[PDB]
Write an enzyme that holds these catalytic residues in place. Structure first.
Site, PDB file in Angstrom:
ATOM      1  N   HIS A   1       0.504  -1.121   0.030  1.00  0.00           N
ATOM      2  CA  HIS A   1       0.030   0.085   0.074  1.00  0.00           C
ATOM      3  C   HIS A   1       0.850   1.226  -0.026  1.00  0.00           C
ATOM      4  O   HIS A   1       0.526   2.246  -0.487  1.00  0.00           O
ATOM      5  CB  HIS A   1      -1.026  -0.199   1.317  1.00  0.00           C
ATOM      6  CG  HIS A   1      -2.004  -1.050   1.324  1.00  0.00           C
ATOM      7  ND1 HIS A   1      -1.936  -2.038   2.346  1.00  0.00           N
ATOM      8  CD2 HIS A   1      -3.063  -1.224   0.706  1.00  0.00           C
ATOM      9  CE1 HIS A   1      -2.926  -2.882   2.258  1.00  0.00           C
ATOM     10  NE2 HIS A   1      -3.521  -2.342   1.119  1.00  0.00           N
TER      11      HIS A   1
ATOM     12  N   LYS B   1     -18.292  -5.745   8.556  1.00  0.00           N
ATOM     13  CA  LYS B   1     -17.018  -6.457   8.829  1.00  0.00           C
ATOM     14  C   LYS B   1     -15.962  -5.589   9.313  1.00  0.00           C
ATOM     15  O   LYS B   1     -15.020  -4.989   8.906  1.00  0.00           O
ATOM     16  CB  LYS B   1     -16.278  -7.063   7.548  1.00  0.00           C
TER      17      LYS B   1
ATOM     18  N   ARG C   1      -2.349  -5.898  -8.177  1.00  0.00           N
ATOM     19  CA  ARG C   1      -1.493  -7.094  -8.281  1.00  0.00           C
ATOM     20  C   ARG C   1      -1.889  -8.127  -9.590  1.00  0.00           C
ATOM     21  O   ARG C   1      -0.676  -8.531 -10.126  1.00  0.00           O
ATOM     22  CB  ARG C   1      -1.153  -7.572  -6.969  1.00  0.00           C
ATOM     23  CG  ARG C   1      -1.371  -6.823  -5.657  1.00  0.00           C
ATOM     24  CD  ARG C   1      -1.009  -7.594  -4.564  1.00  0.00           C
ATOM     25  NE  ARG C   1      -1.783  -8.805  -4.418  1.00  0.00           N
ATOM     26  CZ  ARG C   1      -2.801  -8.644  -3.694  1.00  0.00           C
ATOM     27  NH1 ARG C   1      -3.558  -7.624  -3.228  1.00  0.00           N
ATOM     28  NH2 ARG C   1      -3.966  -9.809  -3.475  1.00  0.00           N
TER      29      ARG C   1
ATOM     30  N   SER D   1      -3.172  -7.647   3.440  1.00  0.00           N
ATOM     31  CA  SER D   1      -3.466  -7.305   4.827  1.00  0.00           C
ATOM     32  C   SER D   1      -3.747  -8.592   5.264  1.00  0.00           C
ATOM     33  O   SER D   1      -3.514  -9.080   6.336  1.00  0.00           O
ATOM     34  CB  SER D   1      -4.406  -6.245   5.135  1.00  0.00           C
ATOM     35  OG  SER D   1      -3.868  -5.103   4.674  1.00  0.00           O
TER      36      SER D   1
HETATM   37  N1  LIG Z   1      -1.988  -4.993  -0.020  1.00  0.00           N
HETATM   38  C1  LIG Z   1      -1.584  -4.600  -0.787  1.00  0.00           C
HETATM   39  C2  LIG Z   1      -1.184  -4.090  -2.151  1.00  0.00           C
HETATM   40  C3  LIG Z   1       0.064  -4.387  -2.812  1.00  0.00           C
HETATM   41  N2  LIG Z   1       0.700  -5.431  -2.000  1.00  0.00           N
HETATM   42  C4  LIG Z   1       0.436  -4.023  -4.051  1.00  0.00           C
HETATM   43  C5  LIG Z   1      -0.245  -3.130  -4.815  1.00  0.00           C
HETATM   44  C6  LIG Z   1      -1.571  -2.741  -4.243  1.00  0.00           C
HETATM   45  C7  LIG Z   1      -1.951  -3.034  -3.001  1.00  0.00           C
HETATM   46  C8  LIG Z   1      -3.194  -2.550  -2.650  1.00  0.00           C
HETATM   47  C9  LIG Z   1      -4.447  -3.273  -2.115  1.00  0.00           C
HETATM   48  N3  LIG Z   1      -5.388  -2.689  -1.800  1.00  0.00           N
HETATM   49  C10 LIG Z   1      -6.664  -3.040  -1.446  1.00  0.00           C
HETATM   50  C11 LIG Z   1      -6.569  -3.826  -0.144  1.00  0.00           C
HETATM   51  C12 LIG Z   1      -7.210  -2.635   0.850  1.00  0.00           C
HETATM   52  O1  LIG Z   1      -8.350  -2.111   0.504  1.00  0.00           O
HETATM   53  O2  LIG Z   1      -6.911  -2.430   2.144  1.00  0.00           O
HETATM   54  C13 LIG Z   1      -4.993  -1.419  -1.994  1.00  0.00           C
HETATM   55  C14 LIG Z   1      -6.032  -0.267  -2.020  1.00  0.00           C
HETATM   56  C15 LIG Z   1      -5.416   1.012  -2.292  1.00  0.00           C
HETATM   57  C16 LIG Z   1      -4.122   1.209  -2.688  1.00  0.00           C
HETATM   58  C17 LIG Z   1      -3.321  -0.051  -2.795  1.00  0.00           C
HETATM   59  C18 LIG Z   1      -3.707  -1.181  -2.604  1.00  0.00           C
END
Ligand SMILES: N#Cc1c(N)cccc1-c1cn(CCC(=O)O)c2ccccc12
Ligand SMILES: N#Cc1c(N)cccc1-c1cn(CCC(=O)O)c2ccccc12
Ligand SMILES: N#Cc1c(N)cccc1-c1cn(CCC(=O)O)c2ccccc12
Ligand SMILES: N#Cc1c(N)cccc1-c1cn(CCC(=O)O)c2ccccc12
Ligand SMILES: N#Cc1c(N)cccc1-c1cn(CCC(=O)O)c2ccccc12
Ligand SMILES: N#Cc1c(N)cccc1-c1cn(CCC(=O)O)c2ccccc12
Lengths: 157, 157, 155, 157, 155, 157
Positions: free
Chosen positions: F17, F41, F90, F127
C-alpha cells in the site's frame, strides 16, 4: 427457422471441432460450417481437402453443411439468411479474444455469436498442436477423426 | 422445436439480463427465464416480485416465458423437454466458472450450455453492484428497466 | 532416482530462468536443461549452452544439452518422464497447461510448474534484449557472465 | 507541474484512444501523446498522417500535445522532464502484459505508469481490428473520429 | 531423499485430487497428504483421512496426516521444504502463486504445481456435494469408496 | 489542482500500500487516503488505529492526508473537490474486479480511476494474508512498515 454459421480454419478438423459441430446441429435447425480461406497463410490442407474431411466427419448430421468462406464473416452469414455465429471455447483467453470479435460483429452488422464450452477431453486439442506433434512422430490419432489421421500421415510423407 | 432455459437469481433483473433475454429469444424457438430460488436464503425481492419485474420488461418477446424453480437446473430443463441452457458472460473469469458448471451439467444430464458475450454497455452491470450502489444513494437508473428502479428504491426505504 | 527436464530457448538465460533451475535442482536428484534448437535468435545454441553452464556451476546435479524434435522423446530417451517449467502469469499457465496435457496424453510425461520469484515477474529474454538494444541497463536481470556477452553481441 | 506521456502506435487513432487522451488531460497538467515509430516496419499511416489525425480530434484539449519518437519510451519521457506514462487497458490480459512493461520501465528508469480502464463502449475497439474489418468492407464509422474514417477508406482504395 | 506435502481440505477427496496424489508420488520419494483442520464441512477430519487412505492403498510412498497451523511449519517439522498442488485454471494459478510466494518468503518452502487431467477440469469437492445433494449422479467423479460414504452422509 | 482519493480498508497498511501511496503522491498535487469503515466486517484494527498507522508510515509525504471514509465513494471524492480515484493492482483478476468498479463509478458520477501496477517485491502481499501468517507465528516483518509490525504483535497477544 433457427440457424448459425460455425467459422474456422479447420486445418484439419479435430474431434474438438466435431464435438462443437454436433452440439450446434443438435440445437439449431441449420448449421453452416464456413471453412475460412486465408490467402496470406495457406496451411497444410487445401480448402477443398478441409471441406472433404469435415463432410466425412459430419456424415450423420443432416442439418449441417460445409462451404468455403471468404471475406467479411458477417456478410457470409447475412447473405445466407442467418444472423448468428457459433464457436467453441477452451480457455478464458479464448473467451477474451472471441468476445471482442463477437462485439465487433454485432456492432457492424447485428449478427450475434453463441459459444459453447469445450468437452473436457478435448481442452488441449488444436489443429496447430496436433500437426506439430504429428510432424515429429507423435501419436495424435485419439484427437482426430479416423479419416483425418490417415490423410494427415499422407501429407507428412 | 428449439428451446433454451436462461437461469439466474434476477434479484433484480438488469438491462444486461434483458439484453441476453432478447438475444436468446431471437435465436431459439422458445426461451424460459428460470428464476432459481434458494429456499434457505431470501434475496431482496420475493419470487413473485422478480417474475413481475421480468414480465413487465419482456412484453415484446412473444416466445419468452418466465418460471421459478429450485434444486438442479438440469432437472428444470429436462422436465420441460429441453436440453439447452443459455447465459451471458462478461469476463474470462465468468467463463472459467461457467465452463465448470456447463461441463458438470453436460456430464450429469446431457444438457448443453450456450453463452453469449455481454453488450459492451453493460459490462459493469450486476444485480449485486447495482443494489450496493443504490443502497448508498448512487444513481443506477440507467442500468435497470423501468419495471425495477423505483421498486428497488422502495425496498431500500 | 528422480529427475526432470527443464526446456526453453534461453536466448539468453536470465536470472528468472536460473532461479527456476536452482529450485528444480533442489527437489529432483537429476535436472537436464534442454536448450531448444528452434531453427531465429540472438545467440547460437552452443553459446546459450555455455552461458547456462557458466551460471549453474554451483549445481552439481544439473547438466545442459541441446534439444531437437519432440520434447517427450527427449525426456523419455534419457529415462525420465517429468518436465519442469516456471510460470509468471495465469496466461502462462493456460498456454503451458495445454502443452502439459498434450505431452501427458501422447507419452505419459508429466509437467511440474513453479511460480516465478517476485523479483523476476517482469523479466524475459525478449524484453531484456529489447531494452538492452535501445541502451537500457539490464545488468541486474542477467547473470554477470551473460551480461558481458550480451554487450558484446550488440557492439 | 504534473505531466504524463500517452504512448502508442495510433495507426490510426480510435475513439477508444481519444477517450483515454481526454481523461488523461483532465487529470494531469500536461499530456504528451507519443506516436512511437518502428523505423523498420511501416504501418498503414505515415507519422505525419498519424499526428494530423490525432491533432484534428484533440483540438479542444489545450494541455495536450502530440509528438513522435522511437527507441526507449522512458528516454522520451525523461528528456521532457516527466516521470509518468499513462495508458488505457481493456482486459486482464492487457494488464498482465502492461504490468510487465511498467515494472521494467520503473526498474530501468524510475518512470511510473498509470492505467485507466476502457470506456465500456470501446472495449472491442482496436486499430488492428478496425483496419481488418474495414479492409473487407465492414462499417467502422462509429469507432473512429471524423479525422480518420475516410482517410482510412482512402488507404484501402 | 526427496519429498513434498500435498495440502487441502479434501471434503471429500475426488478423482481429481487422487490423480494429483498419484502423479506427485511418481516423482517424489515421499508424499504427505495434509488434511487441513479448518475448524465447517461435510466430513470430519478423521473421515477425510480414512477416505484418502482407502483410495491411496496402491501408493507405497504416500501417507496421510491431519494438519493445523502454518503449512510451512507442518512441512519443515517433517524435514521437507516442498508443497505440491494441482491447478485447473489460470485463476487457480493466480491465487496459488500468491500463497506460494508468501510461503517461500517466510520459510524457504517451495511449491510445485501440476495441471489437472482434462477429465477432471470441472470436478471439485464443493460442486460434487452440491450436485449429489440435489440428486445428481457423481459416481464417476469420486473414488468408489468415497461415493458410498457420501450417499450415507446425505441419507 | 490535480488530485486523487486512494480508498481501502488498510487493515493494516502494508508496504505494498505504502509504495502505491508514495507513487500517487509523486504525481498528483494532493492525495487523500480514505480508510473505509465497514460496519458489517469490523477487522483487526479500529479506523482510528488504521489512520494512525498510515500517518506514521507517510510522514514524509506532505501532500498526502488520511481521513476515514463512509458511504458512497464517489460522494466522498466529489465533496472534497476531486474527480479521481487511485488504486494499486497486483493481478489480472484485480484488474477485472476494479475495472467493473471503475466503470460503475464513472457512470454514476463522472469520477475517473487511475491504477498502478504493484512493485514486484510486494505482489504477494495483502493485509489478510499478512494477518493470517502472523497469527500462526510467521514472520511478516519485511512486508509491513516498522510501526505496523510492532502494533500487530500487540494485537496478537
Ligand atoms: N496489500 C496490498 C497491495 C500491494 N501489495 C500491491 C499493490 C496494491 C496493494 C493494494 C491493495 N489494496 C486493497 C486492499 C485494501 O483495500 O486494504 C489497495 C488499495 C489502495 C491502494 C493499494 C492497494
Ligand atoms: N481445435 C479445437 C477446439 C476444441 N478442441 C474444443 C473446442 C473448440 C475448438 C475450436 C477451435 N476453433 C478455432 C480453430 C479453427 O478455426 O480451426 C474452433 C472454431 C469453430 C468451432 C470450434 C473450434
Ligand atoms: N447482470 C448482468 C449481466 C450483464 N450485465 C451482461 C451479461 C450477462 C449478465 C447476466 C448475469 N447473470 C447472472 C444471473 C443473475 O445475475 O441473476 C445472468 C444470467 C442469465 C443471463 C444473463 C446474465
Ligand atoms: N525469463 C523468464 C522466467 C522468469 N523471469 C521467471 C520464471 C520463469 C521464467 C521462464 C521463462 N521460460 C520460457 C522462456 C524460454 O523458453 O526461454 C522458462 C523456461 C524454463 C524455465 C523457466 C522459464
Ligand atoms: N484502441 C484502443 C483502446 C481502447 N479501445 C480502449 C482503451 C485503450 C485503448 C488503447 C490501446 N492502446 C494501444 C496503442 C495503440 O493502439 O496504438 C492505447 C495506447 C494509449 C492509450 C490508449 C490505448
Ligand atoms: N477437486 C479437485 C482438483 C481437480 N479436479 C484437478 C486438479 C486439482 C484438484 C485439487 C483441488 N484442490 C483444492 C481443493 C481442496 O483443498 O480440497 C487440491 C488440493 C491438492 C491437490 C489437488 C487439488
Amino acid at each position: 427457422m433457427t440457424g448459425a454459421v460455425c467459422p474456422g480454419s479447420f486445418d484439419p478438423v479435430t474431434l474438438g471441432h466435431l464435438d462443437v459441430f454436433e452440439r450446434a446441429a443438435a440445437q439449431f435447425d441449420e448449421v453452416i460450417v464456413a471453412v475460412l480461406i486465408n490467402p496470406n497463410k495457406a496451411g497444410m490442407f487445401t480448402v477443398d481437402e478441409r471441406i472433404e474431411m469435415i463432410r466425412e466427419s459430419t456424415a450423420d448430421l443432416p442439418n449441417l453443411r460445409v462451404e468455403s468462406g471468404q471475406g467479411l464473416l458477417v456478410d457470409f452469414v447475412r447473405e445466407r439468411g442467418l444472423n448468428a455465429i457459433v464457436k467453441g471455447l477452451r480457455t478464458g483467453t479464448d473467451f477474451e479474444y472471441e468476445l471482442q470479435m463477437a462485439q465487433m460483429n454485432k456492432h457492424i452488422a447485428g449478427v450475434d455469436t453463441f459459444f459453447v464450452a469445450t468437452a473436457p477431453a478435448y481442452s488441449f486439442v488444436s489443429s496447430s498442436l496436433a500437426k506439430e506433434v504429428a510432424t515429429y512422430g507423435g501419436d495424435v490419432s485419439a484427437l482426430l477423426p479416423a479419416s483425418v489421421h490417415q490423410r494427415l500421415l499422407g501429407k507428412l510423407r
